[PDB]
Amino acid sequence: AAYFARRAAQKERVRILYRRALKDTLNWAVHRHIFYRDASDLREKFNVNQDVEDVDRIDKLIAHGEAEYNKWRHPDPYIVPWAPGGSKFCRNPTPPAGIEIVYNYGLED
Amino acid sequence: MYLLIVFLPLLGSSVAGFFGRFLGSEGSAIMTTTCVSFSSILSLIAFYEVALGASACYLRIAPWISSEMFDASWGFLFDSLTVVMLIVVTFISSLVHLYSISYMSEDPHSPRFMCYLSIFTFFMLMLVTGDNFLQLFLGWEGVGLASYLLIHFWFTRLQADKAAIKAMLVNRVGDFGLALGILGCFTLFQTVDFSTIFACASVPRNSWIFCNMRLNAISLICILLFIGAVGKSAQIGLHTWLPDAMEGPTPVSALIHAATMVTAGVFMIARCSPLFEYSPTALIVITFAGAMTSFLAATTGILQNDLKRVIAYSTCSQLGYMIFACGISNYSVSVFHLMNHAFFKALLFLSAGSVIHAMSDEQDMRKMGGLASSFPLTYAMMLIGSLSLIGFPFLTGFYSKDVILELAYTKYTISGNFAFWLGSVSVLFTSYYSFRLLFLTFLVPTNSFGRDISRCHDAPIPMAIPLILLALGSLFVGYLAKDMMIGLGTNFWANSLLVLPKNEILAESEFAAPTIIKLIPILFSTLGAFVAYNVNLVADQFQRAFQTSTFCNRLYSFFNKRWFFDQVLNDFLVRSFLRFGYEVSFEALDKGAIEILGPYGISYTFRRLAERISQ
Amino acid sequence: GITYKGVTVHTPKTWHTVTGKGLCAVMWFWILYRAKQDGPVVMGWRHPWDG
Amino acid sequence: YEALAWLSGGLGFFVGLGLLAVLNDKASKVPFTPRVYPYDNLRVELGGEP
Amino acid sequence: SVILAGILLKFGTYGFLRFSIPMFPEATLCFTPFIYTLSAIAIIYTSLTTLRQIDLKKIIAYSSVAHMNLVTIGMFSLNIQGIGGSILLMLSHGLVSSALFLCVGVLYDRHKTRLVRYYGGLVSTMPNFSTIFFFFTLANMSLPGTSSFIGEFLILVGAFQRNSLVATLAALGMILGAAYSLWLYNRVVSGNLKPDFLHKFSDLNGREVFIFIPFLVGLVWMGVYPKVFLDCMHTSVSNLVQHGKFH
Amino acid sequence: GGGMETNKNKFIEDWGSARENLEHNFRWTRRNFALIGIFGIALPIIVYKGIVKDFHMQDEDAGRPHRKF
Amino acid sequence: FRAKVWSMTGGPNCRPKHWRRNTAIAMFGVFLVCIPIAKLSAKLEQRPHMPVRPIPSQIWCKNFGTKDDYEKE
Amino acid sequence: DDHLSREAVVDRVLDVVKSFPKVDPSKVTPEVHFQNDLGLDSLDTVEIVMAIEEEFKLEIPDKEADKIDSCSLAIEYVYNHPMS
Amino acid sequence: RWATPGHEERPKGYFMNRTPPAPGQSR
Amino acid sequence: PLGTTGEFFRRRDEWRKHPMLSNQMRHALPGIGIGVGAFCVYLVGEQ
Ligand SMILES: CCCCCCCCCCCCCCCCCC(=O)O[C@@H](COC(=O)CCCCCCCCCCCCCCC)COP(=O)(O)OCC[N+](C)(C)C
Ligand SMILES: CCCCCCCCCCCC(=O)SCCNC(=O)CCNC(=O)[C@H](O)C(C)(C)COP(=O)(O)O
C-alpha cells in the first residue's frame, strides 16, 4: 500500500480517543488521588498492543475501543462555563461588529 | 398605612423602570431596595399589631368585576396567617435586594434586575394579601410571569430562553387545575370571596356531572386546587421546570427557587384550610403526591454535581414534606417549616452564590476542590444553614422536621404510614447529599485551576449583612416559634387556620411518642454522615467509580437524567404535539383536505365545465 | 496570604474571619444551651413541666 | 424507547411500596382510642341545630 | 389588515347576538352541543396549527381565530355573565389583535421579510418596540390585570355552569396560548442578534409611539376596572338572555 | 451596507413560499385517509357524543326528561 | 453602537453625572405621591375587632370597634 | 481581566514540558516539537494538552486540538484565545 | 465607586430617534 | 507516582499542597475551641 492516509487516520483516532478517555477519567474520578492511578491504567491500556501493523487488525480494535468507551460516559461531563455548552455560554457576548442605527426614519417631505 | 405595604414596591419598580436612564446603576439599587426595606418595616409593624395584638384587618378598594352576584373586589385580607408570610416575603426580599447590589455591580443591566425583583415583590404581596380566588389568581399568574422574566434575564443565553419557555408552559399546565378551581367552587356557592365560603363551606354535599362520570363536588374542587398548586410547587405531576430553572442570575434564585414562590403552592392549601378538611378524598391523594415528590427529589439530588442543581432538589424535597404536612390536616408544621425554610435555604442560596461569583463564576463539584481556610465567614454561614437543613437536635430545622415526621407516624391512615416511611427513608438521602455538598467542596484537595485561586476575593461587606441577618434568624427563630404557634391550641390564629375536631392529632403526637421513633431521623442523619465521609474522603478507591459491565452505568444515568422524565415526557407529549400540529391539523383538516374548496380545489373544476359550453 | 508556585492565595480580611469565628461560637454554645435547659424534653427520661 | 422501560419500574417502586403500606394495616394498630368531645361531639359548635 | 381582525371579524359573532339568539330561542338550545363541539375542537386544532408556522402575520391571525372560537362558546352559553364576558372579550380582542398587527407591521415597513427566521435579538436594539410587543403579547398571553382575562374568565364561568366538558376544552385554549405567542416573542425580539440579515434598523418614532398609547391606556383601563363597560349594558344582556321563556 | 431590507437568502425563500401552498402534496395518499378519518370525523363525533351524554346525565340528576336535540 | 439606541430603562452602564441629584428627586417623588395613598386609605381598613392591647394606628384611623352588628349592612 | 502578554506566557507554557520527565529539561526550547527533536512517545501528545489546560482555563476544540504538534503552536494559540 | 461622578454627558440614545435641533429653536 | 503519566501529572500540580491550606481538617469545625469554653464558664458559675 505505502499509503499513510489510512495510518494517519489511526494516529488521529488514537489521540482523539485517548483525550476523550482522559477527560472521562477526570469526570468519573471526582477526587484526584484516585485519578492518578486511573489515568495510569488508561495510559497502560493504550500501550497493551502498541505494535499494530496489519490493516485487518485495526478496524476491529478501534470498533471494540469505541464500543467499550461509549459504555461509560459520565452523563454529566465537564464543560467550561464559557465553552459551547457551559453554564455561562453567551453570558454577555461582544456586540456584533458592524451594525448602524438610523435616526430620522418616518419623516416626510 | 396597610396600602403602603403593597403599593410601595410597585411604585419603586415602576419609577425605576420608567426612569432607569435618569438613575444610574446604583441610584435604582439604593432606591428600590430602600423602598422594599420600608415595606419590610411596615410588614413588621403590621405583624406586631396583628399577630400579637390579635385583630385582623380587612378592607375593600373597588369592585373589579361588578357583574351579577359575582362580586370581584380589590380588597385584601390582612389576616394572622397572611401577616406571617408578609414578614417572610418582605424580609427575604429586602435581604435579596441588598444581596444583589454587590453581585450586579459587574452585570451591566443592573436597574432592570431590581425592577423585576420589585415587580415580583408586588405580585406576591398582592397574592398573599388577597381574599378572592380571582384576585388571588392575578398574583398566582404574576409570580409565574416574574419567574419567567427573571430566568429570562439573559436574552442572549439560549439555554435560559428554552428554560423560561418550558417553565411557563409547565406552570400554565399546572395552575390549569387551580384556574378550573375558581369557577368550580363558584358553581356551588355563587361567590368567589373567602369570608363567604369559609363561613359555610361544609353544607354542600351533592355531586356533579363531569366529563366522564358523576363524582363528588367538594372533593373535585379540592383536587383541582391541588393540581393547580402542583405547578407552583414542583410536585410529582409537573416538576420539570425547577431543576432546569437555575440558568439565570443567582440573587433572584435565592428568592424565586427556594424562598417565596416555593410558598405559593403550599399557601394555596394553607389559605383555604376550611375547604380541604371537608374533602378527605383529596387529602389522601395530596399526601401520596407530596411524599412521592419528596422522596423523588431527595434521591434525585445525590448524583448531581452542581451547586444550584442539587439544592433545587433539596427545595423540592422540602416541597414534598410541606405538601404532606398540608395533606394530613396538620397545617401547623406546614407553615412552621415554611418559615424555617425561607431562612435556612435562602441563606444557603446566598452562600452558594457568594462562593460561586468569588471563584471566577464556577458552579461544580467534580472540578472545584477545597478552599475552606481561604475564607471562613460564608463557610461558617453555609455550615449553619446545612446544620439547620439536616435539622441537628435543638436547632431551627429540627423543631420542624422532627414534629412533621412524628405527625406522619401518628396518623394511621393508609397514606400516613406510607408517607411516614417515605419521609424516614428520605431523611437518610437528604442528610447524605447535604454532607456530600459539605465534603466535595471545602473539605477535599483543591482540584481547580491555578489561575482562579490567585484571583480570589471574599464576600463584600454589603452582601454579607443579609447573610449575617439570616444566620441570626435561623438559629433563634425555631426556638422562639416552637412554643408560640405549635403549642397545643395557641390563640393567635383565630379563623386564619381551622382544624376539624375529628382529624386533630397533636397532643398524642408528643405524649404518645414511643421515643424509639422520635429520635430515629437523627440516627439516619449520623449514618448518612458516616457513609458520606467514608465514600467522599477516604474509601473512594472503589466506592466512587464503578467500571462494571452493565446495570451500574445505567443506574448512574437513571438518576442523573432524573428518571428520564425530560426524555419520555418530551418525546411522548410535546414532540408528538408538534408533529401532529403540522402533519394532522395542517394536512388533513384545513390545508390540503378541505382546501379542495379553495384555490386549486374548485378553480380547476371550472376550467373544464365552463370550457365545454361555448361549443 | 503568601504566594506560592501557582496558589498566590489572598488572606481573608480582618472582619471575614473573626466575625465568622465569634458568630459560629454562638451557635456552638447555643446547641449545648438548648441541650441543657430544654434538653431533658426530648430524651425519654425526666419529662419536664411537672413530670 | 428504552427509557419508558425504566419509567415503569421507577413509578412501580412508588406504587409497590404504597401497596405494602396496605399489607401491614397500621389503622388497627392504634395504641389509643378515637377522640371524643362533649355535647354530641361538639354538635352545636360544628353545625347541626341549636 | 388591522381591521380585518378589528371590525370585519366581529360582524358574524355579533350578528349571532342580535339576529340569532333572541330570534330563535328554541333552535339555539337544540343546536347548542353542535356549536360546542365545533368551537371546542377549533380552539385546539387552530392553536396546534399555529405552532408550526413561520410567517409573522399568520400566527397573530391564528391566535385571533382561536380567540373568536373561544368567544363563540361563551356567547351560545346563555348566561347573564356569559354574554357580557363575550362582549368584553370581543372588545379586548379588537384592541389587542389590532395592536399586535401594528406591532408586526412596523417591522415589515422597515425590513420587508415577514419571516421569524430573519428576525432575532431585537431587544439589544429598539427596546421601546420590544417593551410594547411584550406588553401586547402578555395581553394576548391572557394574563389577569389585562382586559383579555376579564374577557375569557367570564366565558369559562358561563360555559362551566352549563356544561362541564366544554369548559375544560375551552381552558385548554388558554393553556395552549402560551405555546405559540410566547415562543414568537422569544424567537423574534429576544434571540441572538444576527448582523448577516438585519444589517441596520431604527426604532419607533413619535408616530407609532403615540399609536400604541390609546391601545395601552384602553387595555389597562378595561382590564383593571371593567365596571363601566359592564355597567353600561347589564340591562340589554338581561333582556337578551330572558326571551321567549317566562321562568 | 446601506440596505435596510433583508438579504432574502435563496435557501430560505423556498422554505418560506413552499409551506404556503401544500395543496399539491396533500391530495391522495394512504396516510392522509387514516389521519382525516381519525382526526376530523372521529374526534368531533366522540366529543359531540360526550357533550350530549353530559347533558343527558345533567338532565337525569335534575329528573327532567332529556331533550331530543 | 449602544449609544445610538435609547434604552428607556437606562443603557447597560448608564451612569449620569448628577445621578445623586436625580435619585434625591426620585425618592422625594415617591414620598410626595405616597401620602395620597396613605391619606385615601384612612377612610378604609375596617377592622371590627378590638385588639387586647393598644396599637399605634388609632390616630389616623377610626374604623375599629364600630362595625359591630351585622343586621343593618 | 489583565490579559497577560507574551512575557508571562513564555515561562508558564514551557514549564509544562519542562516538568515532563520523558523529555530531558536541558534542551527544552520555546520553538520545538516533541515528535523528533525532544523524542516523545506518540501517545503522550495530548497529555501535555491536558496539563496546559489544567493551568490555563481553555479547551481547544478536538478538531484541531491535536493539530498542535509543536510547543510554538500551543503558546501562540493560548495567547490568541482571549479567555485563557 | 459611590462618590465618583458618572462618565456620561447625556443619556445615550435619542428619544423616538428624533435628533434634537440646534439650541434656541423649537421642535 | 508511577504510571509514566502519573508522575508528570503530580509533579506539575505540586502547588496543590499550599502548606497554609495543606489540609482543612482542623478547619472543618472552627468554633469548637470557644463554644465549649463559654458553655463551661456559664455552667460552672451559675451553680
Ligand atoms: C400581568 C400583566 C401586568 C401588566 C404588564 C406589565 C408588567 C411588567 C411587564 C413589563 C416588564 C418589563 C419587560 C420589558 C421587556 C423586557 C425586555 C426589554 O425589552 O428590555 C427593554 C425594556 O426594559 C424594561 O424592562 C422597561 C420596563 C418598563 C415596565 C415598567 C412598568 C412595570 C410596572 C407596571 C405594572 C402596572 C402597574 C399597575 C397599573 C394600575 C430594555 O432593557 P435594557 O436594560 O435597556 O436592555 C436592552 C439592551 N440594550 C440596552 C442594548 C438595548
Ligand atoms: C471510561 C472510558 C475509558 C475508555 C477505556 C476503553 C478505551 C478502549 C480500550 C480498548 C481498546 C484499546 O485498548 S485502545 C489502544 C489503541 N492503540 C493503538 O491503536 C496503537 C496504534 N499504534 C501505532 O499507530 C504505531 O505503533 C505508533 C505510531 C508507533 C504508535 O503511536 P500512536 O499509537 O500514539 O499513534
PDB file of N, CA, C and O in Angstrom, chain A residues 26-28 30-34 37-38 71 74-79 81 86-93, chain B residues 154 156-157 305 360-364 366-367 440 444 447 536 540-541 544 548-549 553 556-557 560-561:
ATOM      1  N   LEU A  26     -11.167  11.875  34.293  1.00  0.00           N
ATOM      2  CA  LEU A  26     -11.235  13.010  35.206  1.00  0.00           C
ATOM      3  C   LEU A  26     -12.650  13.201  35.737  1.00  0.00           C
ATOM      4  O   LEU A  26     -12.842  13.510  36.919  1.00  0.00           O
ATOM      5  N   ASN A  27     -13.655  13.028  34.874  1.00  0.00           N
ATOM      6  CA  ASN A  27     -15.041  13.187  35.314  1.00  0.00           C
ATOM      7  C   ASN A  27     -15.433  12.126  36.339  1.00  0.00           C
ATOM      8  O   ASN A  27     -15.973  12.452  37.403  1.00  0.00           O
ATOM      9  N   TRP A  28     -15.177  10.851  36.035  1.00  0.00           N
ATOM     10  CA  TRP A  28     -15.508   9.778  36.972  1.00  0.00           C
ATOM     11  C   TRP A  28     -14.740   9.929  38.278  1.00  0.00           C
ATOM     12  O   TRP A  28     -15.313   9.804  39.367  1.00  0.00           O
ATOM     13  N   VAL A  30     -13.892  11.954  40.724  1.00  0.00           N
ATOM     14  CA  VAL A  30     -14.188  13.255  41.319  1.00  0.00           C
ATOM     15  C   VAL A  30     -13.012  13.723  42.165  1.00  0.00           C
ATOM     16  O   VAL A  30     -12.569  14.873  42.068  1.00  0.00           O
ATOM     17  N   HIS A  31     -12.484  12.833  42.997  1.00  0.00           N
ATOM     18  CA  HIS A  31     -11.255  13.095  43.726  1.00  0.00           C
ATOM     19  C   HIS A  31     -10.061  12.665  42.883  1.00  0.00           C
ATOM     20  O   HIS A  31     -10.153  11.743  42.069  1.00  0.00           O
ATOM     21  N   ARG A  32      -8.935  13.352  43.075  1.00  0.00           N
ATOM     22  CA  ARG A  32      -7.811  13.176  42.167  1.00  0.00           C
ATOM     23  C   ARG A  32      -6.810  12.126  42.634  1.00  0.00           C
ATOM     24  O   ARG A  32      -6.113  11.546  41.794  1.00  0.00           O
ATOM     25  N   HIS A  33      -6.727  11.843  43.939  1.00  0.00           N
ATOM     26  CA  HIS A  33      -5.767  10.841  44.392  1.00  0.00           C
ATOM     27  C   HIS A  33      -6.087   9.455  43.846  1.00  0.00           C
ATOM     28  O   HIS A  33      -5.214   8.582  43.851  1.00  0.00           O
ATOM     29  N   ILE A  34      -7.315   9.237  43.371  1.00  0.00           N
ATOM     30  CA  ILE A  34      -7.608   8.065  42.556  1.00  0.00           C
ATOM     31  C   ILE A  34      -7.412   8.349  41.069  1.00  0.00           C
ATOM     32  O   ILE A  34      -7.174   7.412  40.293  1.00  0.00           O
ATOM     33  N   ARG A  37      -3.957   6.991  39.560  1.00  0.00           N
ATOM     34  CA  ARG A  37      -3.909   5.564  39.260  1.00  0.00           C
ATOM     35  C   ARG A  37      -4.803   5.217  38.075  1.00  0.00           C
ATOM     36  O   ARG A  37      -4.425   4.403  37.225  1.00  0.00           O
ATOM     37  N   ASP A  38      -5.991   5.820  38.006  1.00  0.00           N
ATOM     38  CA  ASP A  38      -6.888   5.553  36.887  1.00  0.00           C
ATOM     39  C   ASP A  38      -6.282   6.019  35.568  1.00  0.00           C
ATOM     40  O   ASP A  38      -6.345   5.306  34.559  1.00  0.00           O
ATOM     41  N   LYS A  71     -19.613   2.898  26.545  1.00  0.00           N
ATOM     42  CA  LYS A  71     -20.464   2.227  27.522  1.00  0.00           C
ATOM     43  C   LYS A  71     -20.527   2.997  28.836  1.00  0.00           C
ATOM     44  O   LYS A  71     -21.563   2.979  29.510  1.00  0.00           O
ATOM     45  N   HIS A  74     -20.297   9.113  31.921  1.00  0.00           N
ATOM     46  CA  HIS A  74     -20.487  10.140  32.939  1.00  0.00           C
ATOM     47  C   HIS A  74     -21.493  11.169  32.438  1.00  0.00           C
ATOM     48  O   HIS A  74     -21.097  12.266  32.024  1.00  0.00           O
ATOM     49  N   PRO A  75     -22.801  10.837  32.444  1.00  0.00           N
ATOM     50  CA  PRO A  75     -23.819  11.686  31.800  1.00  0.00           C
ATOM     51  C   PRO A  75     -23.674  13.187  32.021  1.00  0.00           C
ATOM     52  O   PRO A  75     -24.207  13.980  31.240  1.00  0.00           O
ATOM     53  N   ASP A  76     -22.973  13.590  33.077  1.00  0.00           N
ATOM     54  CA  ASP A  76     -22.680  14.999  33.295  1.00  0.00           C
ATOM     55  C   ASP A  76     -21.185  15.257  33.130  1.00  0.00           C
ATOM     56  O   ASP A  76     -20.463  15.374  34.129  1.00  0.00           O
ATOM     57  N   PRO A  77     -20.683  15.351  31.901  1.00  0.00           N
ATOM     58  CA  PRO A  77     -19.254  15.621  31.704  1.00  0.00           C
ATOM     59  C   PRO A  77     -18.934  17.081  31.985  1.00  0.00           C
ATOM     60  O   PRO A  77     -19.815  17.935  32.095  1.00  0.00           O
ATOM     61  N   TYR A  78     -17.641  17.362  32.102  1.00  0.00           N
ATOM     62  CA  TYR A  78     -17.194  18.719  32.380  1.00  0.00           C
ATOM     63  C   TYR A  78     -17.194  19.543  31.099  1.00  0.00           C
ATOM     64  O   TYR A  78     -16.608  19.136  30.089  1.00  0.00           O
ATOM     65  N   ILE A  79     -17.848  20.701  31.141  1.00  0.00           N
ATOM     66  CA  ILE A  79     -17.796  21.688  30.071  1.00  0.00           C
ATOM     67  C   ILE A  79     -17.496  23.040  30.699  1.00  0.00           C
ATOM     68  O   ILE A  79     -18.115  23.412  31.702  1.00  0.00           O
ATOM     69  N   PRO A  81     -17.636  26.806  31.618  1.00  0.00           N
ATOM     70  CA  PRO A  81     -18.875  27.602  31.592  1.00  0.00           C
ATOM     71  C   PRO A  81     -19.017  28.505  30.379  1.00  0.00           C
ATOM     72  O   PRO A  81     -20.133  28.666  29.869  1.00  0.00           O
ATOM     73  N   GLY A  86     -21.495  25.318  28.269  1.00  0.00           N
ATOM     74  CA  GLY A  86     -21.250  25.578  29.669  1.00  0.00           C
ATOM     75  C   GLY A  86     -22.386  26.322  30.346  1.00  0.00           C
ATOM     76  O   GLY A  86     -23.477  26.505  29.801  1.00  0.00           O
ATOM     77  N   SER A  87     -22.111  26.754  31.577  1.00  0.00           N
ATOM     78  CA  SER A  87     -23.096  27.422  32.417  1.00  0.00           C
ATOM     79  C   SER A  87     -23.173  28.925  32.190  1.00  0.00           C
ATOM     80  O   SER A  87     -24.078  29.567  32.733  1.00  0.00           O
ATOM     81  N   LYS A  88     -22.251  29.511  31.423  1.00  0.00           N
ATOM     82  CA  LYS A  88     -22.371  30.920  31.073  1.00  0.00           C
ATOM     83  C   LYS A  88     -22.037  31.160  29.607  1.00  0.00           C
ATOM     84  O   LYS A  88     -21.552  32.237  29.247  1.00  0.00           O
ATOM     85  N   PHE A  89     -22.282  30.171  28.751  1.00  0.00           N
ATOM     86  CA  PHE A  89     -22.121  30.383  27.320  1.00  0.00           C
ATOM     87  C   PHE A  89     -23.057  31.494  26.865  1.00  0.00           C
ATOM     88  O   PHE A  89     -24.243  31.500  27.207  1.00  0.00           O
ATOM     89  N   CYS A  90     -22.514  32.436  26.093  1.00  0.00           N
ATOM     90  CA  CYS A  90     -23.243  33.637  25.686  1.00  0.00           C
ATOM     91  C   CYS A  90     -23.756  34.407  26.902  1.00  0.00           C
ATOM     92  O   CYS A  90     -24.885  34.902  26.914  1.00  0.00           O
ATOM     93  N   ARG A  91     -22.922  34.495  27.941  1.00  0.00           N
ATOM     94  CA  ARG A  91     -23.272  35.275  29.125  1.00  0.00           C
ATOM     95  C   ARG A  91     -23.568  36.721  28.752  1.00  0.00           C
ATOM     96  O   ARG A  91     -24.703  37.195  28.881  1.00  0.00           O
ATOM     97  N   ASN A  92     -22.552  37.434  28.278  1.00  0.00           N
ATOM     98  CA  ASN A  92     -22.718  38.793  27.759  1.00  0.00           C
ATOM     99  C   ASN A  92     -21.830  38.928  26.535  1.00  0.00           C
ATOM    100  O   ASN A  92     -20.751  39.530  26.587  1.00  0.00           O
ATOM    101  N   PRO A  93     -22.253  38.363  25.406  1.00  0.00           N
ATOM    102  CA  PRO A  93     -21.368  38.295  24.240  1.00  0.00           C
ATOM    103  C   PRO A  93     -21.020  39.676  23.715  1.00  0.00           C
ATOM    104  O   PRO A  93     -21.766  40.641  23.894  1.00  0.00           O
TER     105      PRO A  93
ATOM    106  N   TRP B 154     -31.284  36.861  30.840  1.00  0.00           N
ATOM    107  CA  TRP B 154     -30.174  36.754  29.899  1.00  0.00           C
ATOM    108  C   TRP B 154     -30.775  36.382  28.548  1.00  0.00           C
ATOM    109  O   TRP B 154     -30.883  35.204  28.204  1.00  0.00           O
ATOM    110  N   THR B 156     -29.557  36.821  25.595  1.00  0.00           N
ATOM    111  CA  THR B 156     -28.573  36.188  24.722  1.00  0.00           C
ATOM    112  C   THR B 156     -28.442  34.699  25.022  1.00  0.00           C
ATOM    113  O   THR B 156     -28.281  33.887  24.103  1.00  0.00           O
ATOM    114  N   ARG B 157     -28.505  34.326  26.299  1.00  0.00           N
ATOM    115  CA  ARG B 157     -28.330  32.942  26.724  1.00  0.00           C
ATOM    116  C   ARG B 157     -29.416  32.043  26.147  1.00  0.00           C
ATOM    117  O   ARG B 157     -30.587  32.159  26.521  1.00  0.00           O
ATOM    118  N   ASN B 305     -23.853  17.114  40.383  1.00  0.00           N
ATOM    119  CA  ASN B 305     -22.575  17.680  40.804  1.00  0.00           C
ATOM    120  C   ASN B 305     -22.506  19.189  40.586  1.00  0.00           C
ATOM    121  O   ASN B 305     -21.461  19.728  40.221  1.00  0.00           O
ATOM    122  N   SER B 360     -14.437  32.916  40.128  1.00  0.00           N
ATOM    123  CA  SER B 360     -14.470  33.024  38.668  1.00  0.00           C
ATOM    124  C   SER B 360     -15.724  32.394  38.066  1.00  0.00           C
ATOM    125  O   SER B 360     -15.677  31.823  36.974  1.00  0.00           O
ATOM    126  N   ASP B 361     -16.848  32.490  38.779  1.00  0.00           N
ATOM    127  CA  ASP B 361     -18.161  32.101  38.264  1.00  0.00           C
ATOM    128  C   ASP B 361     -18.186  30.633  37.831  1.00  0.00           C
ATOM    129  O   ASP B 361     -18.496  30.294  36.686  1.00  0.00           O
ATOM    130  N   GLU B 362     -17.854  29.758  38.776  1.00  0.00           N
ATOM    131  CA  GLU B 362     -17.852  28.316  38.548  1.00  0.00           C
ATOM    132  C   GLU B 362     -18.752  27.658  39.584  1.00  0.00           C
ATOM    133  O   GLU B 362     -18.614  27.918  40.783  1.00  0.00           O
ATOM    134  N   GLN B 363     -19.676  26.824  39.120  1.00  0.00           N
ATOM    135  CA  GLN B 363     -20.576  26.063  39.986  1.00  0.00           C
ATOM    136  C   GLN B 363     -20.446  24.584  39.615  1.00  0.00           C
ATOM    137  O   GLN B 363     -21.140  24.083  38.730  1.00  0.00           O
ATOM    138  N   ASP B 364     -19.545  23.888  40.304  1.00  0.00           N
ATOM    139  CA  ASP B 364     -19.276  22.491  40.005  1.00  0.00           C
ATOM    140  C   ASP B 364     -18.772  21.786  41.255  1.00  0.00           C
ATOM    141  O   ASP B 364     -18.246  22.412  42.179  1.00  0.00           O
ATOM    142  N   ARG B 366     -17.280  18.289  40.625  1.00  0.00           N
ATOM    143  CA  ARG B 366     -16.205  17.454  40.101  1.00  0.00           C
ATOM    144  C   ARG B 366     -14.893  18.219  39.978  1.00  0.00           C
ATOM    145  O   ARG B 366     -13.820  17.642  40.185  1.00  0.00           O
ATOM    146  N   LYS B 367     -14.954  19.506  39.638  1.00  0.00           N
ATOM    147  CA  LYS B 367     -13.761  20.291  39.344  1.00  0.00           C
ATOM    148  C   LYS B 367     -13.249  21.077  40.543  1.00  0.00           C
ATOM    149  O   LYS B 367     -12.048  21.065  40.818  1.00  0.00           O
ATOM    150  N   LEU B 440     -17.503  17.382  49.263  1.00  0.00           N
ATOM    151  CA  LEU B 440     -16.892  17.520  47.943  1.00  0.00           C
ATOM    152  C   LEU B 440     -16.342  18.916  47.708  1.00  0.00           C
ATOM    153  O   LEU B 440     -15.513  19.103  46.810  1.00  0.00           O
ATOM    154  N   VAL B 444     -11.787  18.831  50.557  1.00  0.00           N
ATOM    155  CA  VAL B 444     -11.015  17.931  49.702  1.00  0.00           C
ATOM    156  C   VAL B 444      -9.830  18.697  49.141  1.00  0.00           C
ATOM    157  O   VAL B 444      -9.814  19.936  49.151  1.00  0.00           O
ATOM    158  N   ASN B 447      -9.018  20.722  43.433  1.00  0.00           N
ATOM    159  CA  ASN B 447      -8.904  20.191  42.082  1.00  0.00           C
ATOM    160  C   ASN B 447      -9.143  21.256  41.020  1.00  0.00           C
ATOM    161  O   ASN B 447      -9.267  20.924  39.838  1.00  0.00           O
ATOM    162  N   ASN B 536     -16.550   9.818  50.372  1.00  0.00           N
ATOM    163  CA  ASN B 536     -16.029  11.008  49.717  1.00  0.00           C
ATOM    164  C   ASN B 536     -14.737  11.535  50.328  1.00  0.00           C
ATOM    165  O   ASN B 536     -14.222  12.552  49.851  1.00  0.00           O
ATOM    166  N   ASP B 540     -12.698   5.827  48.695  1.00  0.00           N
ATOM    167  CA  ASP B 540     -13.148   6.203  47.361  1.00  0.00           C
ATOM    168  C   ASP B 540     -12.414   5.443  46.264  1.00  0.00           C
ATOM    169  O   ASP B 540     -12.570   5.780  45.084  1.00  0.00           O
ATOM    170  N   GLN B 541     -11.615   4.433  46.618  1.00  0.00           N
ATOM    171  CA  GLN B 541     -10.879   3.683  45.607  1.00  0.00           C
ATOM    172  C   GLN B 541     -11.803   2.832  44.743  1.00  0.00           C
ATOM    173  O   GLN B 541     -11.527   2.631  43.555  1.00  0.00           O
ATOM    174  N   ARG B 544     -16.322   4.972  44.664  1.00  0.00           N
ATOM    175  CA  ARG B 544     -16.613   6.169  43.884  1.00  0.00           C
ATOM    176  C   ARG B 544     -16.868   5.864  42.413  1.00  0.00           C
ATOM    177  O   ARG B 544     -17.930   6.206  41.885  1.00  0.00           O
ATOM    178  N   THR B 548     -18.104  -1.311  36.044  1.00  0.00           N
ATOM    179  CA  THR B 548     -18.604  -2.666  35.875  1.00  0.00           C
ATOM    180  C   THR B 548     -19.041  -2.889  34.428  1.00  0.00           C
ATOM    181  O   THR B 548     -18.776  -2.079  33.535  1.00  0.00           O
ATOM    182  N   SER B 549     -19.721  -4.011  34.191  1.00  0.00           N
ATOM    183  CA  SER B 549     -20.159  -4.347  32.840  1.00  0.00           C
ATOM    184  C   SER B 549     -21.466  -3.648  32.483  1.00  0.00           C
ATOM    185  O   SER B 549     -21.524  -2.861  31.533  1.00  0.00           O
ATOM    186  N   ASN B 553     -23.731   1.511  35.110  1.00  0.00           N
ATOM    187  CA  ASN B 553     -23.723   2.758  34.352  1.00  0.00           C
ATOM    188  C   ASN B 553     -25.142   3.256  34.118  1.00  0.00           C
ATOM    189  O   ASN B 553     -25.414   4.460  34.215  1.00  0.00           O
ATOM    190  N   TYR B 556     -26.374   4.922  37.073  1.00  0.00           N
ATOM    191  CA  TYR B 556     -25.878   6.294  37.110  1.00  0.00           C
ATOM    192  C   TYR B 556     -26.713   7.204  36.215  1.00  0.00           C
ATOM    193  O   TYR B 556     -27.057   8.326  36.604  1.00  0.00           O
ATOM    194  N   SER B 557     -27.049   6.734  35.012  1.00  0.00           N
ATOM    195  CA  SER B 557     -27.801   7.558  34.071  1.00  0.00           C
ATOM    196  C   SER B 557     -29.248   7.748  34.510  1.00  0.00           C
ATOM    197  O   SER B 557     -29.845   8.794  34.230  1.00  0.00           O
ATOM    198  N   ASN B 560     -29.118  10.542  37.162  1.00  0.00           N
ATOM    199  CA  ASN B 560     -28.587  11.767  36.573  1.00  0.00           C
ATOM    200  C   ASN B 560     -29.604  12.418  35.647  1.00  0.00           C
ATOM    201  O   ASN B 560     -29.808  13.636  35.696  1.00  0.00           O
ATOM    202  N   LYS B 561     -30.258  11.622  34.802  1.00  0.00           N
ATOM    203  CA  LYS B 561     -31.291  12.115  33.905  1.00  0.00           C
ATOM    204  C   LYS B 561     -32.658  12.167  34.572  1.00  0.00           C
ATOM    205  O   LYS B 561     -33.672  12.312  33.878  1.00  0.00           O
TER     206      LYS B 561
END
